[PDB]
Design a protein around this ligand. Structure first.
Ligand SMILES: O=C(COc1ccccc1)NC1CCCCC1
Ligand code: NI
Length: 341
């Protein structure tokens, strides 16, 4: 059964609703981004129209094998008519291909669905600038003031400086970066760039990255592991056992591993600043957890919502408990009273 917060009223549209079978009355299925919780249920035998970004469409075709006849890519920042309704796709500042969707309902109501997003002041100068939004379907992943983390730029500066120092001290060190989905590619691309190397990876991960429209990608990545001193591995292998195993396979080329585990928020963000971050170490292996977020911090979310001044907010994350629903509703009311809308 498809839940209410994935339906768009007054239309035949759903958003990120592929795991409920045939949804009654749905004429077009929107997909905000290529993350498995959101695409859950999509496969090669899907036979209804799917509306999405170009990048998401490339991933649907090549990774899930959805037939081309059902993939409807739309350009960003452009008014489009879908089944008699005006829509706009906006960059979500999440992973590659991720969008927010503006719906202009036939009755005059305007709805914004953020999908997953990392709110930014630049969104205040998007096509949102003009206009009234009556309903906001909001990515509330980190909707509590405890959720603090640095800018993406600060985290990348830390990673580049850490990697460059380690490899300049020991030219026989290998750098390894964990991954389990699209997103956060800047981590491994920025480290490889400072080290003068391509990024080495499996055939499967190479295929995925080839779908993302990254400029000059062929100059940046490779399946030839021997040519590369920055390697990508599944996130599940970023531990002392897994990294020891990997080092054995490298034919005596390296005598040290420096590894990065991009995470979201963790409770060490309540205590330790990015500059003060230290690794876990066992012998010649060191592992850094770095808080590289592709979701809004509490402060970023609050700024966006107080600027947009929506008439009603519908959370799309942390909706499953009464305690988390009540917590979110209290913050929305504070924000409204503070700003006066
Ligand atoms: O209980 C939770 C579960 O996730 C929530 C996320 C947003 C709003 C409400 C809940 N988190 C807590 C972590 C430690 C301190 C802050 C809330
Ligand atoms: Ni996501």
């Amino acid at each position: 059964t498809c839940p209410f917060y994935k339906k768009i009223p007054g239309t035949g549209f759903t958003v990120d609703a592929f795991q409920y079978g045939v949804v009654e009355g749905c004429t077009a299925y929107f997909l905000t981004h290529f993350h498995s919780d959101h695409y859950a249920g999509l496969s090669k035998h899907f036979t209804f129209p799917v509306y999405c970004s170009e990048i998401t469409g490339n991933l649907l075709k090549n990774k899930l094998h959805v037939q081309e006849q059902y993939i409807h890519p739309l350009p960003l920042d452009t008014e489009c008519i879908v089944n008699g309704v005006k829509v706009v796709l906006l960059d979500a500042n999440h992973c590659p291909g991720a969008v927010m969707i503006l719906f202009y309902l036939p009755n005059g109501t305007v709805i914004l669905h953020t999908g997953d997003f990392r709110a930014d002041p630049s969104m205040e100068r998007s096509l949102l600038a003009d206009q009234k939004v009556h309903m906001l379907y909001l990515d509330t992943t980190y909707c509590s003031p405890e959720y603090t983390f640095p800018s993406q730029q600060e985290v990348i500066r830390f990673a580049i400086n850490t990697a460059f120092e380690a490899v300049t001290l020991n030219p026989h060190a290998l750098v390894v970066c964990g991954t389990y989905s699209i997103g956060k590619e800047k981590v491994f691309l920025a480290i490889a760039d400072v080290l003068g190397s391509k990024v080495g990876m499996s055939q499967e991960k190479y295929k995925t990255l080839q779908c993302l429209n990254i400029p000059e990608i062929n100059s940046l990545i490779t399946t030839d592991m021997c040519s590369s001193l920055v390697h990508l591995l599944p996130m599940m292998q970023i531990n002392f056992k897994g990294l020891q195993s990997h080092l054995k396979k490298c034919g005596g080329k390296y005598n040290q591993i420096l590894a990065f585990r991009p995470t979201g928020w963790t409770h060490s963000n309540k205590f330790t600043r990015i500059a003060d971050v230290i690794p876990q170490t066992k012998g010649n292996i060191s592992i850094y957890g770095i808080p590289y977020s592709e979701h809004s911090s509490y402060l970023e979310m609050k700024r966006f919502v107080q600027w947009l001044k929506p008439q009603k907010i519908i959370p799309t994350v942390n909706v499953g408990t009464w305690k988390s629903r009540s917590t979110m509703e209290k913050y929305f009311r504070e924000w409204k009273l503070e700003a006066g809308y």
